[PDB]
Amino acid sequence: KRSRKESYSVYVYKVLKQVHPDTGISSKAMGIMNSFVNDIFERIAGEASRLAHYNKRSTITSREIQTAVRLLLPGELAKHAVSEGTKAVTKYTSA
Amino acid sequence: KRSRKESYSVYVYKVLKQVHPDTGISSKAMGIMNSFVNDIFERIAGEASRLAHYNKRSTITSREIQTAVRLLLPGELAKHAVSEGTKAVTKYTSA
Amino acid sequence: KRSRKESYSVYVYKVLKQVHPDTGISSKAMGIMNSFVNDIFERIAGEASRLAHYNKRSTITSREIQTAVRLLLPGELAKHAVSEGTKAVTKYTSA
Amino acid sequence: KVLRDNIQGITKPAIRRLARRGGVKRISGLIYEETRGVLKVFLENVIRDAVTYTEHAKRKTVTAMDVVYALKRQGRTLYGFGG
Amino acid sequence: KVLRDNIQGITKPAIRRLARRGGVKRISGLIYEETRGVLKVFLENVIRDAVTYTEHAKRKTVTAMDVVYALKRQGRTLYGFGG
Amino acid sequence: ARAKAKTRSSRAGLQFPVGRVHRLLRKGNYSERVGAGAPVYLAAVLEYLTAEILELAGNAARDNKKTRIIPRHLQLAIRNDEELNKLLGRVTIAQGGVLPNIQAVLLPK
Amino acid sequence: ARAKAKTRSSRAGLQFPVGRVHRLLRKGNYSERVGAGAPVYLAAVLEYLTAEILELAGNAARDNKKTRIIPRHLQLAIRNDEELNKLLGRVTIAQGGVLPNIQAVLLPK
Amino acid sequence: ARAKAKTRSSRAGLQFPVGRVHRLLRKGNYSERVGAGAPVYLAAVLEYLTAEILELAGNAARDNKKTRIIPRHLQLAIRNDEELNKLLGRVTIAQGGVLPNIQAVLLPK
Amino acid sequence: KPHRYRPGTVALREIRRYQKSTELLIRKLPFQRLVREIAQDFKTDLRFQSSAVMALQEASEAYLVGLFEDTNLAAIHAKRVTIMPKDIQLARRIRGE
Amino acid sequence: KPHRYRPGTVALREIRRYQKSTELLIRKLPFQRLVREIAQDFKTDLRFQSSAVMALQEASEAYLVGLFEDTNLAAIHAKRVTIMPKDIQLARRIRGE
């Protein structure tokens, strides 16, 4: 066959059926979605790397990730993001 | 008892001497040069990391370094820069 | 086989593969290159002997031939060649 | 084998359609050639780095991924072609 | 300590001085208010970024190196402060 | 004697893969040492970000009475949210178009 | 018993530290491994840029007859070279100021 | 137990033969004593001059669409720079010809 | 009498029409010829994916339509309705190229 | 009768002066007071290194002066010599903020 190629199609498709069970996707739109995921992912990853370099910490942790999303994502979207992410932290710490 | 803070100051002062032995330096301009070399260094380093990530090379090589030199530096600066870089890496290869 | 005729061909070939890897050589222009290198060598070496004579100095060193190239070859190429020559004598001083 | 003039291949009505999408309702006659010039500049700046990306990859066929890298370095990042 | 009306602490002739550095030949009297507003927006953004940096740093004090980082991530890099 | 193979995304209760992004940060070269909770954090952030943009897109698709999402609706959704436009002002969408916008002086009397 | 200590900057024959740049790139986390010639090449291109910009600094200083440099002269140097301006459009120098520039319509007559 | 035979041309990091130039000065009958740095200095200046004239050879070859140098390229390179002309005013290049140069009064109305 | 609209009304109609639509404005084969032409100016004999060409043409049209909306803002700011190349030069100078 | 220059001549003189000079045109104490006042709004009881304050001083002056040649280009672009707030609004919106 062919070597496996990663995509974010199935996860966004679960997100869609959570948010709108009725609708479908175009593949062009899903290409934009994959580009969006990778772009925001690398932006926050670069923030994570630079902030970890700045305070001379050999680890990356979530604390600077709240720092990163609060600096990068503006305002109420960022504070919403803090809300779901920290509660996701609570479920992950409770396993 | 103190702990060091490094800079590029000695190298800037030396290269100031062999470009022009008879001229002086102000300290705040010399810090501007420090941060300038730091900024160019970080730009090239990030671009180099990105190129090494693109071609799935886990090792960074001078080939993509000079590729990034054309990538950032425009034209005249780029072609002369790859000239001294090439002749320097040949001197190191002989060394 | 015939006895060796020393010439300055291969060195100019090497320096052109630093300055233009692509471009080719005609042999009569190559003899012209040998004529430049020999003639300028003759001018500067005769001036070096002369300047060693006038200051009654027994030894040909870099400083008086620096004086001589500041004499004969004019201006910008002279001061640049001064720069590479100082660089070369300093790095050769460091063996 | 070689081509010498295709900047006129970007015709005036295509520029007019772009200007209508730009919201221009009235276009001077002097617009078209200077828009061609700035298009020339922008395409040079992107394709220089694009073929630079390509030649570092030791490829003689370009990839769209490298075009994505060229535009995102230039600050005009594109969605819809990564992957 | 606690102050109220420091937007007017940037005086009108100081704004005239910046405008003459900008090469403005004539300044309207209306100009100073929106220059205060634009300065307010810009400083608010960059110092929000800076306080975010230092609250990550577990420092109660503002450092210049954080200000350097905050300016350069916005695309308005400055030199001369150890960056 | 091994326990059941359970997934960390379910442990957070979210849908983006924790292990995939954990591997991505391990190979993306942003730190040599990675904390456990940060990939969970970012996965939740991105999944929510997809949630509001998908809500805006689906509402736009319902407004334009199409039941399969199209890039035009993505462009119209993102350009109509102020904070996402501040997030995404410098990005270009393939086959997207722009907002319907005419200036007042361009309109006739 | 052991080779005499001689630095890699001497081997490159250039003044910027090969070892410090090597160490900074190793702990700057840009790849898992680093080639030998790459930091040397980076230091060389940096010192070339410093060479030309301090040439501009020096002759701009002799324009104002001051043997010690001012960052004003640095801003003059950056703004009077078009490729260095293109490198440095979005960065400003401390106490840098602006070029002497007036619009022609602002002049009398 | 001898160290490896390594060359002074490499020690000066230049292409021109330091040893042969030293030998040609020694039997060129200019002094009975000669310093070590003088042939290195000569090697340096002759590298730089051959480098600049070869750059001129390269672009004078390239703009006439030739990838191999000709003495016409050499003549057009040298005679179009006044400083090399003051270096080489009394110098003739074989098959070099002259610059394309017509006096303005020779041209028709 | 054959019907003829007053000027600008039809122009506003293409504004609405191509602002509602997204489909691409330029003939793709001439611009493919142009990108091959300009690509050969750096290095000889490049091959192109059609995906790459279409991707770069969205990027190009986005850049152009951005600078047209800037010159719209400039021309309206100049109390005029017609764009002229000095307006575009103004916009390009303001953006910082 | 006492001497009095015509309008613009004096202004051109300090234009030349402040183009020549590099010193900071904002008074330091109310500026840093404003910085402390606004920084209080996001978190309480902040202390400032002085060099940070002077750094963000020239950052502010650079941002304003940059949008000032933007404003000047807009003003001369509209064939005027006096700037208006919509010039600054135009310049910022072209820059995209």
Author numbering:
A (entry chain D), B (entry chain H), C (entry chain N): 30 to 124
D (entry chain F), E (entry chain B): 20 to 102
F (entry chain C), G (entry chain G), H (entry chain M): 10 to 118
I (entry chain E), J (entry chain A): 37 to 133
Q: What did the original publication write about this model?
A:
Here, we report cryo-EM structures of human H1-containing tetranucleosome arrays with four physiologically relevant NRLs. The structures show a zig-zag arrangement of nucleosomes, with nucleosomes 1 and 3 forming a stack. H1 binding to stacked nucleosomes depends on the NRL, whereas H1 always binds to the non-stacked nucleosomes 2 and 4. H1 contacts DNA with L1, the amino-terminal part of α2 together with L3, and α3 to stabilize the nucleosome and contribute to chromatin compaction.
In all structures, nucleosomes 1 and 3 form a canonical stack, whereas nucleosome 2 is located in a DNA loop between the two stacking nucleosomes and is rotated relative to the nucleosome stack. In our structures, we observe a compact stacking of nucleosomes 1 and 3 that is similar to type I interactions with a contact formed between H2A–H2B dimers. The observed stacking does not allow for interactions between the H4 N-terminal tail of one nucleosome with the acidic patch of a stacked nucleosome and thus leaves the H4 tail free to engage in other interactions. Whereas the inter-nucleosome interactions appear to be very similar, we note a slight relative tilting of the stacking nucleosomes that positions their dyad axes almost parallel, in contrast to type I interactions in which the dyads are slightly tilted toward each other. H1 is absent from the stacked nucleosomes of the 4×177 array, but is present on nucleosome 1 in the 4×187 and 4×197 arrays, and is present on both stacked nucleosomes in the 4×207 array. To confirm that our observations are not a result of low salt concentrations, we solved the trinucleosome core structure of the H1-bound 4×177 array at 60 mM NaCl and confirmed the presence of nucleosome stacks and the absence of H1 on stacking nucleosomes. Altered linker DNA trajectories, as observed in our 4×177 array, sterically preclude H1-linker DNA contacts that are required for stable H1 binding. Stacking of nucleosomes 1 and 3 is apparently stabilized by H1 binding to nucleosome 2, because a published structure of a 3×177 trinucleosome array lacking H1 adopts a non-stacked, extended conformation.
